[PDB]
Design a binder for this molecule. Structure first.
Ligand SMILES: [K+]
Ligand SMILES: [K+]
Ligand SMILES: [Mg+2]
Ligand SMILES: [Mg+2]
Ligand SMILES: [Mg+2]
Ligand SMILES: [Mg+2]
Ligand SMILES: [Mg+2]
Ligand SMILES: [Mg+2]
Ligand SMILES: [Mg+2]
Lengths: 61, 119, 271, 178
RNA sequence: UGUAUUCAACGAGUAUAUAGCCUUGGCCGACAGGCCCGGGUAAUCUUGGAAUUUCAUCGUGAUGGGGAUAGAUCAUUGCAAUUGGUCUUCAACGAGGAAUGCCUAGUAAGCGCGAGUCAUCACUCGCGUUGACUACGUCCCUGCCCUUUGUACACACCG
RNA sequence: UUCCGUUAACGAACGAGACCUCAGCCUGCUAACUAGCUAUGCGGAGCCCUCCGCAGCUAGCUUCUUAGAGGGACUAUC
């Protein structure tokens, strides 16, 4: 339950291109920058919730 | 898409090449001049040509382009002949001679040239 | 010269600002917004109106649209008092007569037309903006020349060919004794109507939309693209989207104010 | 204010208890709140355009199923009015609040695709919640004494123990195992 | 299912023989159908042009969903029986396995109308009505195109 | 294979684009008794006002329908 704001979008990835990989920062701690993936439609400036804040990602997944 | 057919590109280039004197920046003035300075059948082709000409006037008002000619700076000649200083850029004294060139001037050349230097 | 205020009630270019001779606060702005305004709105045309004027009595408004026609309007009711149709090419400018009974119009058809306000007799003789002499008529041409006509028989009086660029409009003295031009050359030519010879020049720099003569100060205000320039008749300028150009200048009857027609509707008053 | 839902519901009482699903729901009482969820506006033109659409419009448009029900938005908004009256009269609160609570408690957070688990878009979250609620109401309404409004009302209050919450539970269970 | 509001476009329509087409209106007939007054060789006349929407009986039951199938019966079309009216009969059918097709906006989906077919009998071509979910990405599959590369293929990998 | 450019290529033919039909906007124009809008007059009901129908060989108009010439958009401005 660590709400994160989408900071940049790294293009659609995946087999069908359904998942979209983005970089986010926490609203509780702005200075921490993580990479995650999101289904559905995502634009910059949005706020996204999660459950586990420790999972990492890769560039151009 | 919005890219321009070679016909409209060409005709815009020609109308600017031969009619840069009066044609202005507004699109509607460009089209009302095009309709009588040239015969274009399709009205929307004429609109495309007028808009393209306006875009190239925006391009050219900052500097010259690679497309048009005549009055070959943009509108007036005599750009570089005026770059003639009252004294030549080439000096004649203490003119850039080194050890091996000194040995050369000891060879067939004259070692007492006016521009000889000990550098 | 200082700022009075700003206007933002227009969505396109206002091309002509006309004020009644009687100095009454019923000025008419004719715009290429397909709409007019009264400081009442007019929309009877279907194209972009260019030139507007106000009758001598000050209770009517004459405006011509780029569709190629002209209309004289009942200002109070906002309805056309009369139409004027027969300019196949788009009209460019309008003006009244010395008695404000005949209407002179210049269009894109390389010709000028005189119309009766009520009569059915019409006569004809790219002609730019025209302004009748308060009785010859001056006009701009398509070859950097300014023509002066004769009202006695609709004949050409003389031609003035000293302009390096095209002539976008003409200026006449309030007493009908001067002529002035301007254009892309940036040098405004001033001549005398009587002899029709070149008097002198003033330096501005670029296109001047409207050249307005001061009725009282005997001055000349020009809407140069670089900076609006005002001369006194010492020939010396004794006025300031990435593109910024005016469209018209209008001298007030009082003489202490002036009104500008701009591009994005920012009508500005100076005093 | 001067704008109320069916001249009956006041929008200036409903908030969202989250800072991640605010802009996607048109519940703010400054704009985007309408008289009824029926409007002939275009929302599929550009991306993220349906976020500006009112939430009630989304709820009433997601009920025109199955193929024997589409093109009948009139029944949809009538049924939403009936279920709205049921909810307000029972719970003694603003039915907009119950709708928002049900939507905000019926959105799944994570899925698993490609099999790796990863999060869900908030617009997809609200869309999935609305689709789940409508399908659950349809399931509870088929071959039963209940009418549409009654099952819709029950699923709306139960989601503020319910079909939609159990569907989200199993989806999240499948997600969290990978 | 039964009452009661009611909003479209496209097109088509005569040989006048009493009258072959569109049919208005009046009368008769439960309905199907018949007689009379007639109009339109056409923006004139047909042309005055449904789902949906208040109200109620159902009440979760293979039930008033469904009407397959049958019998009795009347009349129209046709030279000669096709269809349409009335009642009775009331089958499978309670969202459909592997597979599988169409579609991104007034679109899909739902509901009718006209024309072609025609002595009589509606699938195809258009017309309009109600009207959304998601996506706005990709080459994962199915293909298409280009560049490099390999080839013992050239009927060209079904080689 | 649309263009800009690069260029042992230069200059050209098709295809694409261009073209044509229809729809989308016009209180601008053209003009409508085989199409309409409004007022009035008459008759219908509860002077006026709500109101339905009928004329006025021009009451006026084409905003509403028809069909024509035209315009509008060209990516121009940010
Ligand atoms: K049956
Ligand atoms: K009356
Ligand atoms: Mg019914
Ligand atoms: Mg209708
Ligand atoms: Mg049944
Ligand atoms: Mg049955
Ligand atoms: Mg067939
Ligand atoms: Mg009209
Ligand atoms: Mg156009």
């Amino acid at each position: 339950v660590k709400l994160a704001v989408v900071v940049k979008v790294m293009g659609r990835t995946g087999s069908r291109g359904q998942v979209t990989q983005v970089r986010v920062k926490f609203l509780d701690d702005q200075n921490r920058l993580i990479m995650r993936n999101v289904k559905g439609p995502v634009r910059e400036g949005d706020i996204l919730t999660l459950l586990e804040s420790e999972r990492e990602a890769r560039r151009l997944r | 898409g919005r890219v321009r057919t070679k016909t409209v590109k060409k005709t815009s280039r020609q109308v600017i090449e031969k009619y840069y004197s009066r044609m202005t920046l507004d699109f509607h003035t460009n089209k009302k001049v095009l309709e009588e300075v040239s015969i274009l059948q399709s009205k929307r082709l004429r609109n495309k040509v007028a808009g393209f000409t306006t875009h190239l006037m925006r391009r050219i008002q900052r500097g010259p382009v690679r497309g048009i000619s005549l009055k070959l700076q943009e509108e007036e000649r005599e750009r570089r002949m005026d770059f003639v200083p009252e004294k030549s850029a080439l000096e004649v004294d203490e003119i850039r001679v080194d050890k091996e060139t000194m040995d050369m001037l000891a060879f067939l050349g004259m070692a007492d040239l006016p521009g000889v230097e000990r550098a | 010269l200082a700022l009075v205020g700003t206007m933002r009630g227009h969505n396109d270019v206002v091309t002509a600002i006309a004020a009644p001779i009687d100095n009454s606060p019923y000025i008419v702005s004719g715009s290429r917004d397909k709409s007019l305004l009264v400081w009442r709105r007019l929309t009877g045309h279907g194209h972009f109106v260019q030139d507007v004027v106000i009758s001598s009595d000050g209770q009517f408004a004459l405006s011509g649209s780029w569709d190629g026609e002209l209309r004289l309007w009942d200002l109070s009711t906002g309805l056309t008092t009369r139409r004027f149709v027969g300019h196949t090419k788009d009209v460019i400018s309008v003006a009244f007569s010395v008695d404000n009974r005949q209407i002179v119009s210049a269009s894109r058809d390389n010709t000028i037309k005189l119309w009766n306000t009520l009569g059915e007799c019409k006569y004809t003789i790219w002609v730019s903006c025209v302004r009748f002499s308060p009785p010859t008529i001056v006009s701009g041409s398509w070859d950097k020349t300014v023509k002066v006509w004769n009202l006695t028989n609709c004949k050409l009086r003389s031609t003035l060919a000293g302009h390096g660029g095209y002539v976008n409009a003409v200026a006449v003295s309030p007493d009908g004794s001067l002529c002035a031009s301007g254009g892309k050359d940036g040098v405004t030519l001033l001549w005398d109507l009587s002899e029709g010879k070149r008097l002198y020049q003033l330096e501005a720099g670029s296109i001047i939309h409207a050249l307005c003569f001061s009725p009282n100060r005997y001055w000349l205000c020009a809407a140069t693209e670089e900076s609006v320039k005002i001369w006194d008749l010492s020939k010396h300028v004794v006025l300031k989207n990435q593109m910024l150009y005016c469209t018209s200048l209008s001298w007030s009857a009082d003489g202490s104010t002036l009104y500008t027609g701009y591009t994005d509707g920012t009508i500005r008053v100076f005093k | 204010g001067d704008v109320k839902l069916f001249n009956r519901w006041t929008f200036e009482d409903v908030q969202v208890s989250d800072i991640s699903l605010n802009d996607y729901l048109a519940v703010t009482s400054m704009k985007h709140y309408t008289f009824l969820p029926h409007s002939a506006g275009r929302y599929s033109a550009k991306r993220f355009r349906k976020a500006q659409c009112p939430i009630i419009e989304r709820l009433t448009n997601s009920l025109m199923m199955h193929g024997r029900n589409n093109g009948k938005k009139i029944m949809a908004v009538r049924i939403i009015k009936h279920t709205m009256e049921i909810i307000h009269l029972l719970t003694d609160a603003n039915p907009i609040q119950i709708i928002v609570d049900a939507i905000i408690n019926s959105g799944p957070r994570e899925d698993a695709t490609r099999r790796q688990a990863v999060d869900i878009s908030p617009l997809r979250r609200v869309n999935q919640a609305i689709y789940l609620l409508t399908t659950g109401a349809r399931e509870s309404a088929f071959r039963n004494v209940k009418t549409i409004a009654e099952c819709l009302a029950d699923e709306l209050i139960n989601a503020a123990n319910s079909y939609a919450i159990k569907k989200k539970d199993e989806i999240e269970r499948v997600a969290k195992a990978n």
